Design a protein around this ligand. Structure first.
Ligand SMILES: Cc1ncc(COP(=O)(O)O)c(CN)c1O
Ligand SMILES: Cc1ncc(COP(=O)(O)O)c(CN)c1O
Ligand SMILES: [Mg+2]
Ligand SMILES: [Mg+2]
Lengths: 398, 398
């Protein structure tokens, strides 16, 4: 035995899945990507319905031009930390774009969203302090908790009551960080932020909200679920990503706290990594600024989401949500076999969706997760519904 | 008090530095970057001598063209994990480029070097196992240890003897990971890998070597210090980055272990983050492949390093190394004031180098760290030496 013997189980589990005859879901390659909604997979033209490209920004002509210009003018990389030689013109631009987008004085960009969560959580809450989070929080949030030295307080998923009871049992004096997500990514339902933030404030906690799955399409300014629920000016920190609506790679945290920018001085995942390439921060800047006023896209996105959600529910699919509350539509299946058969039938018929099985999901939960794009056409959505009808019948789901 | 009160000290320390009249070293902006060796900083044309762009790849015409083509053909981002919708043509290309570069069957790319270290260390060594590392290891290596659940065994910096004694006191049966760096980044000296790896193998440990600071210019194939020291086929895992010689952003681990690619199934910083943008992996692929045969650049790099090292030592600067052993030349100063005065004089005269002061360095260590580029000209290196002579005299260092 050696250090890799611990993976023998996972290797066996993968081979068991492949023995069923399914395409390996963890090894899909997009050989060509024609647009935000169309790819070539296994040599076949395929509609994409499993990406987080919510606003279709990845092929936006201004975004692409900004990226090409940055490569030409600044080269392929920075070869340094933000605290040394890695801050170029476009890094200052992208942080200002975020300030303008969120209406905040503070904005700190990280090289990934994962690192933003890892860093901000492990840096803000120290020994003797508390991080309070939903039981089903994103892995990066849990990993931030593990990286830090704070006391970790999980509360029952989606429970305002358990948040209140758990917070109330903590000592009053130590500082506390309540970490929430606007959209629950697994099923695409929405957190009761208004109520949970009121509870957080009652107990004197600071609040961090992750608005990765809402950027550009919730709230009057597209700032997220917190904005939609009337919490402007009440959220201490908002964390997000450049990899979803923005369409590149990177993370960020914004805040109006007067000492916020001091996080740069302490935050290990900010300090000890190269800054993002000029092209990445240039594309992000352009995308973020366009997202501030991307009303046509926002309306299309929601129209598409409502059509897909409404259509799938009407056919008799069990969905994760009764109403269309986000750009994620989760189809719930009875067992792992049904999920894989559905996923393969859709793929072979020209549609890519994400499958989620245990341990990605909780035991007994087997999902196809569809994610809508502003650049899906009404025609594509009807084609997708037709494909779900055909696959659902062939497999015996509906 | 709140969660940010803990930064009051760092805020005060920064203000104390600025009270001396120095430019804030942590807020330098490259307003224009003309080439790998020339920038505009504070409106002034400045020679760059503080980047990790060792092989000058960031303005390579093939690298830039590959990046522009990828933006055009695949868009600005992937909007997904490598385990789902985020693996495009160019991600498969970059992993194959690494296999070819290192002569390995296995290659796993991460979204940053930081995350590669964080992930590989915390995933390979579990509860009841051991990670053995140099006391002065890179922050990302320490952060990987913190993220995991293994027993952490520090050994005295650069001590083959302490590595041997510390390893030998551990129980024999549990699996062990010895983590080493080829180049010690602070002073630019080289690890005794041949001897330390022999010790690791005597005790049955697996070995991970970080070759971030050696890629393309140590060993016959440019694979790193381990290759230069004759250890081909003896290193279980090599970790690296795309942000230094390669000239973009990203991390990787390569290996010939038959179960290596199973790490994808378990590694949280691989799974729970978006993959790199098409342009980033395209530029990396092109750069990595060119680095395999970049002999002119390699010779220039070493010629430049020898000239700078030899020149600075001849003037009476105390260097971190007696001989030119890497592309980092560290100038050691007597106190923090001398370092800042030297750094400012160089900057005002048209030269950027990195300053390192406590707590970045150990107490009593005050450095200017110069990093050479293959695209520095002999003329630039002599200009730099002249600037060091003038600054060193004006400040009273030499
Ligand atoms: C809610 C949430 N927060 C943070 C992240 C991390 O973002 P990134 O992909 O930029 O690392 C993710 C990744 N899907 C996420 O879903
Ligand atoms: C030795 C070493 N290893 C790993 C890293 C992390 O690499 P990256 O900048 O790609 O995150 C660094 C960052 N300087 C490093 O110096
Ligand atoms: Mg095209
Ligand atoms: Mg130019």
């Amino acid at each position: 035995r050696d250090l890799l013997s611990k993976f023998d189980g996972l290797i066996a589990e993968r081979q068991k899945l492949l023995d069923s005859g399914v395409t390996d879901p963890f090894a899909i390659v997009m050989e060509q990507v024609k647009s935000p909604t169309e790819a070539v997979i296994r040599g076949k033209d395929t509609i994409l319905l499993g990406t987080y490209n919510y606003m279709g920004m990845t092929f936006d002509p201004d975004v692409i031009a900004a990226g090409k210009e940055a490569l030409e003018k600044f080269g392929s990389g920075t070869n340094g930390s933000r605290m040394l030689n890695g801050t170029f013109h476009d890094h200052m631009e992208v942080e200002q774009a975020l300030r303008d987008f969120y209406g905040t004085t503070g904005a700190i960009v990280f090289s990934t969203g994962y690192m933003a969560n890892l860093g901000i959580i492990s840096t803000l809450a120290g020994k003797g302090e508390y991080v309070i989070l939903d039981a089903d929080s994103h892995a990066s949030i849990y990993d931030g908790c593990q990286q830090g030295n704070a006391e970790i307080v999980r509360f029952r998923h989606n429970s305002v009551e358990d948040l209140d009871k758990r917070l109330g049992r903590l000592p009053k004096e130590p500082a506390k960080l309540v970490v929430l997500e606007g959209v629950y990514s697994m099923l695409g339902d929405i957190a009761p932020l208004k109520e949970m933030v009121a509870v957080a404030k009652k107990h004197g906690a600071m609040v961090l909200v992750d608005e990765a799955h809402s950027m550009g399409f919730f709230g009057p300014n597209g700032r997220g679920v917190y904005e939609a629920q009337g919490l402007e000016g009440q959220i201490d920190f908002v964390v997000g990503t450049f990899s979803k609506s923005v369409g590149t790679v990177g993370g960020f945290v914004v805040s109006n706290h007067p000492k916020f920018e001091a996080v740069r001085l302490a935050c290990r995942p900010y300090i000890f990594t190269a800054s993002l390439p000029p092209s990445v921060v240039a594309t992000a800047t352009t995308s973020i600024r366009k997202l501030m006023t991307a009303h046509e896209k926002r309306e299309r996105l929601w129209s598409n989401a409502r059509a897909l959600h409404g259509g799938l529910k009407a056919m008799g699919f069990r969905l994760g949500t009764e109403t269309c509350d986000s750009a994620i539509v989760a189809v719930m299946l009875e067992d792992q076999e049904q999920a894989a058969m559905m996923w393969q039938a859709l793929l072979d018929g020209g549609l890519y969706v994400n499958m989620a099985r245990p341990p990605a999901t909780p035991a007994g939960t087997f999902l196809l997760r569809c994610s809508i794009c502003a650049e899906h056409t009404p025609a594509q959505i009807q084609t997708v519904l037709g494909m779900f009808q055909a696959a659902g019948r062939a497999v015996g789901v509906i």
